[PDB]
């Protein structure tokens, strides 16, 4: 339309209509210019042998991408509290994505002081892979999410991807995907961008805890873990963190089994034992990148699934013991709980076969999840010489561009019909006075979530 | 339309449809100010070479020009595989070229700094020669192609042209074109420029290698070439680099025969010999300009035609030997092979007569090949002095202008009909590991092409 | 690609994986230490699917 008239409006709201929900969210994003506009190869060889299982090869493109894949980008902690207490199951239906008010900047430094200045004409490229032709990196639970708190201006992560390798060296069946190779809309300070998508039919997430224990059809499959007691003295005095792993191996390379098949964290009454790789472990606000104390982190626990699913630190049964059991006919089992901080969809790989695709971290396994949305600044070159040069231009203006993002996802709900006479279990805050209200900013403006929140509260008969 | 509203969008795709293909490609570009806004004159003397062979005369103009003439611009090394393996030949039909998102930056130079700021009102001139009035430079296989790898940002080459000469002096017939006398379009920061073209009907390019040798009619014409061996002990220890080469002569100036009519590189089974001037020798990536040694240059070979065309290091026969042979009736031959890095078209000169006009370096010879596109910045004059002076203004504002460029060509194909029982040769990557992926960016960030690619793989009965 | 490496090499996960059970060589050294699964270490990242 034009430079002066806005390209959109700010919608953050949630509107509860009957059995369905519309949850919209809008944040600000700054996208710097990564890799000086240069695709490059990445691999760690720090040693001629390097690391057995930590060696990798791939590329690192300049494009940034949008991760909204987490629940707390769409839900205000109330709307979550409203969601878990009153409902048995839910599931996404449609997603609407609007990207507006692009603002481009030009960082020029003169006489020791660098001064930002609007570059009106410069453009920003964006596209959505709707054929899932690029590597799908949103499934790995990476940071870089939309921020949980609307007032937080956030920065956009970089997109790079990995491919086949032997040692740190690639092999011909690797492939190099140029992202420039797709058609992508360009945007100036006046344009916006919008698209919609329909979620493929997925079974509801079942948010409830069976109220009727299975043995009162045989319990589901189990893959044992080691057991760690949060109280340190209970644990053996040895470096068993990696040696005592539960690790599936592929192509000679080991992978710790994290989280593994859904299993109750611990037996009835013992809450201080968690399985080693068994649980998602979320860090509190301000938790350090490395070697942070046990209490800097929140530990998810699946007590609710214990009735049907076998405990993660005890063996399955006796025929000698049986540590790892497959699928027998007549099993039943429950999924892994989805949490406020935890992911939503994770893309199913494309194979000739799979079994019960619901992904081990939780969420909705989808052969066709919401596309990636890739973005970069149109590179604007610095003054090229008057003398013609064969080589490509290696010097560009510094630049970055900012603006708004909105997303609106329609969730369909399943009401509670229960005939239970006595009261349910609801999730409520505590009245007990405290220095700072949970789930709100402290005196420096730091929005900090004190606890994970699971979705299994209401109960059913088995 | 306006400042803030993007004029045109990034299109880069390949669309494989039935028998015909569409390859669109885009690039980013910066245009300096050439020759300080002055038509100039150039001889060998201004360059400094005193030979008669290298004598020339002509002008060198501000206007820039686009060159997509090279295959690697439109086709991505995937396609040029899928393009060659599966097909008995091709040719272009329609080329569409656009140019949008002009931006104009006015470099400012201080005592120690030069800050770039937009000059919104400034303009850019562009036009295309559709009547083929100007000289046509695209037929010399010059540098300055659109880069092969889309994220590159390529500098536009200058436009200059040679005219008739005696020594460094002209003759009255030597003529001088002033491009400003051609009607052109003027583009401020909001306007775009686009046209379409139609390739005049030419023979399909022949992509195939005859399975059956001619002697199992007569072979085609031959002009011998001194045989040079990549085993440098075998080669005679003498300075035969210039004296040895065959050279077609004109107007008293000997011009090397480059490459010359299509002939086989070497006798079957001897791969280390090559025509001294017969075959194109592409520079590898990273290769310097001058006095390079052997491994820094890829060397094509014509082996696929060794059935029909006679060896370029051999005599055509005996009658006493025959070193050169013109066309007899009842001859047959096949033209030179187009390569991924090679040219696409050249312009059949305007004459009263010619024979088999399809060019030597490969590609599709045309009497109305795609027009050139010339471009320049309309100069903004610096402040005049308050009192008139008849002179032309010699002081201008230092600018360059950048933007996008995109081109869409439609190739047509000819299917493979063969009833051959046993499998073919197909071009492919080599699975074996390597420190880098061929045809992809390394750790440094510079895109390299390891090897040329011919178009002749499938076989036909002769 | 391959099923273990589906991860993105540039960006740390928000999941933490226990990395140390002891402080150092000695007696009564039991301790817990958690860390981010990140491109630095890719063997331990929590992944969706298993062969």
């Amino acid at each position, epitope marked *: 339309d034009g430079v002066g008239s806005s390209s959109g409006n700010w919608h953050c709201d949630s509107q509860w209509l009957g059995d369905r929900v519309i949850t919209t969210s809008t944040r600000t994003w700054a996208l710097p210019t990564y890799n000086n506009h240069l695709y490059k190869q990445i691999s760690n060889s720090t040693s001629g042998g390097s690391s057995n299982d930590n060696a990798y090869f791939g590329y690192s493109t300049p494009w940034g991408y949008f991760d909204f894949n987490r629940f707390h980008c769409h839900f205000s902690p109330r709307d979550w509290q409203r969601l878990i207490n009153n409902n048995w199951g839910f599931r996404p239906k449609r997603l609407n994505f609007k990207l507006f008010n692009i603002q481009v900047k030009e960082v020029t430094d003169n006489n020791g002081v660098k001064t930002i200045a609007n570059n009106l004409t410069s453009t920003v490229q964006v596209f959505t892979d709707s054929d899932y032709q690029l590597p799908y990196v949103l499934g790995s639970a990476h940071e870089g999410c939309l921020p949980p708190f609307p007032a937080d201006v956030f920065m956009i992560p970089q997109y790079g991807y990995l491919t086949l390798n032997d040692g740190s060296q690639a092999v011909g069946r690797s492939s190099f995907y140029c992202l420039e190779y797709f058609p992508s809309q360009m945007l100036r300070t006046g344009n916006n961008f919008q698209f919609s998508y329909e979620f493929e039919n997925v079974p509801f997430h079942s948010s409830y805890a069976h109220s009727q224990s299975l043995d009162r059809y045989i319990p589901g499959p189990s893959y044992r873990q080691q057991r760690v007691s949060t109280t340190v003295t209970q644990n053996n005095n040895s470096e068993f963190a990696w040696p005592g792993a539960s690790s599936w191996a592929l192509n000679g390379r080991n992978s710790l089994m994290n989280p593994g098949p859904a299993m109750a964290s611990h037996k009835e009454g013992e809450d201080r034992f968690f399985p080693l790789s068994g649980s998602l472990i979320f860090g509190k606000q301000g938790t350090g*990148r490395d070697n*942070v104390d046990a209490d800097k982190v929140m530990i998810t626990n699946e007590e609710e699934i214990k009735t049907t699913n076998p405990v993660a630190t005890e063996s399955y049964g006796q025929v000698g013991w049986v540590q790892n059991q497959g699928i027998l006919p007549g099993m039943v089992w429950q999924d892994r709980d989805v949490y406020l901080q935890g992911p939503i969809w994770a893309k199913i790989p494309h194979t000739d076969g799979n079994f019960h695709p619901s992904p081990l971290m939780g969420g909705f396994g989808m052969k066709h999840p919401p596309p990636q949305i890739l973005i970069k600044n149109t590179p604007v070159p610095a003054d090229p010489p008057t003398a013609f040069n064969k080589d490509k231009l290696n010097s560009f203006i510094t630049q970055y561009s900012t603006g708004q993002v909105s997303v609106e996802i329609e969730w369909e709900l399943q009401k509670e019909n229960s005939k239970r006479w006595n009261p349910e279990i609801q999730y409520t805050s505590n009245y007990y006075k405290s220095n700072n209200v949970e789930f709100a900013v402290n005196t420096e403006g730091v929005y900090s979530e004190p606890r994970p929140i699971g979705t299994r509260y209401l109960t059913r008969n088995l | 339309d306006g400042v803030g509203s993007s004029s045109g969008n990034w299109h880069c795709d390949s669309q494989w449809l039935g028998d015909r293909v569409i390859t669109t490609s885009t690039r980013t570009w910066a245009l300096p100010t050439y020759n300080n806004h002055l038509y100039k004159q150039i001889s060998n003397s201004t360059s400094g070479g005193s030979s008669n062979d290298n004598a020339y005369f002509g002008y060198s103009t501000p206007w820039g020009y686009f060159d997509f003439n090279r295959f690697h611009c439109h086709f991505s090394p995937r396609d040029w595989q899928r393009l060659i393996n599966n097909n008995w030949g091709f040719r272009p039909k329609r080329l569409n070229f656009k140019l949008f998102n002009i931006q104009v930056k006015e470099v400012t130079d201080n005592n120690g*700094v030069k800050t770039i700021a937009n000059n919104l009102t400034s303009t850019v001139q562009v036009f295309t020669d559709s009547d083929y009035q100007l000289p046509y430079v695209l037929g010399s296989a010059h540098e300055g192609c659109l880069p092969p790898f889309p994220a590159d940002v390529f500098m536009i080459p200058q436009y200059g042209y040679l005219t008739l000469n005696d020594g460094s002096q002209a003759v009255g017939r030597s003529s001088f074109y002033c491009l400003e006398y051609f009607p052109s379009q003027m583009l401020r920061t909001g306007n775009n420029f686009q046209f379409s073209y139609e390739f005049e009907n030419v023979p399909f390019h022949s992509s195939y290698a005859h399975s059956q040798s001619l002697d199992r009619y007569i072979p085609g014409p031959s002009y011998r070439q001194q045989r040079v061996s990549t085993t440098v002990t075998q080669n005679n220890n003498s300075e035969f680099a210039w004296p040895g080469a065959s050279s077609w002569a004109l107007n008293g100036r000997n011009s090397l025969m480059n490459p010359g009519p299509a002939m086989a590189s070497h006798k079957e089974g001897e791969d280390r010999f090559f025509p001294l001037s017969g075959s194109l020798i592409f520079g590898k990536q990273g290769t310097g300009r001058d006095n390079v040694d052997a491994d820094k240059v890829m060397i094509t070979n014509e082996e696929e035609i060794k059935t029909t065309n006679p060896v370029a290091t051999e005599s055509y026969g005996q009658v006493g030997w025959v070193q050169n042979q013109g066309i007899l009736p009842g001859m047959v031959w096949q033209d030179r092979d187009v390569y991924l890095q090679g040219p696409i078209w050249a312009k059949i000169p305007h004459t009263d007569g010619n024979f088999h006009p399809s060019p030597l370096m490969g590609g599709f010879g045309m009497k109305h090949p795609p027009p050139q596109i010339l471009i320049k910045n309309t100069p903004v004059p610096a402040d005049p002095p308050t009192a008139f002076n008849k002179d032309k203004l010699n002081s201008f504002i230092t600018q360059y202008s950048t933007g996008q460029v995109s081109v869409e060509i439609e190739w047509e194909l000819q299917k493979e009909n063969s009833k051959r029982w046993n499998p073919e040769i197909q071009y492919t990557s080599n699975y074996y590991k390597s420190n880098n992926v061929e045809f992809a960016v390394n750790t440094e960030g510079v895109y390299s092409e390891p090897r040329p690619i011919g178009t002749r793989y499938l076989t036909r009965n002769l | 690609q391959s099923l273990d490496r589906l991860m993105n090499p540039l960006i740390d996960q928000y999941l933490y994986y226990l990395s140390k059970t002891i402080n150092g060589s000695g007696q009564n050294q039991q301790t817990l230490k958690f860390s981010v699964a990140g491109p630095s270490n890719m063997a331990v990242q929590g992944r969706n699917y298993i062969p």
Partner: antibody
Amino acid sequence: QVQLVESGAEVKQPGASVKVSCKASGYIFTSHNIHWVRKAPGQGLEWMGKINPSGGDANYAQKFQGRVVMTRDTSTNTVYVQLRSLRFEDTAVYYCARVHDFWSGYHRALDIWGQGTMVIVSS
Amino acid sequence: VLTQPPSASGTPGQTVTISCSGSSSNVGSHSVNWYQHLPGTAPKLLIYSNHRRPSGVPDRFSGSKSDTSASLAISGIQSEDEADYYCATWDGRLNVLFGGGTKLTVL
């Protein structure tokens, strides 16, 4: 091999400004930033800030935000810091180092440093 | 800016654990690196990241980083090894923050 070369020393009396030069020889020179670390006698290393090679825009340090000015040139392939107001306090050996990522997006460190530079400032 | 011990003892054939400490924003979110500096010569990058050593560096040098505090411990020492050390780190704007001079004494 990747190398960074400061110029020779100068001796400049307080109030004088002295620029320093760093020649990046053997690499692209636009993909990596260049950090200026200073050491004044009996003091720790001190970071005068970085320039973004291709960018031309610099990020200075809290202490040096006023006085220090950074400029570069791609053609001569060198980068310049200019300390406009020399003082007795500002007597140090100046270094230019580059960020080097060791072929990984994730890691950042100053792998290559120049041989050195020393500024003797005294009236 | 980081706070580390300024003077650190040594004796031939003994390891030396060199401590560095910082706030969560400055060092928690950022990997510390250690630079070895000899007066009159350019600094060397011993350890880049928490536990990694560059190809040039010897096997004995190592690194142990934990939340705020990030240490360094070197093995089989010599007086030929003895020089000044530094604790380098990166903030949110990626300003580089050097902890302070720690120089050994070998005797």
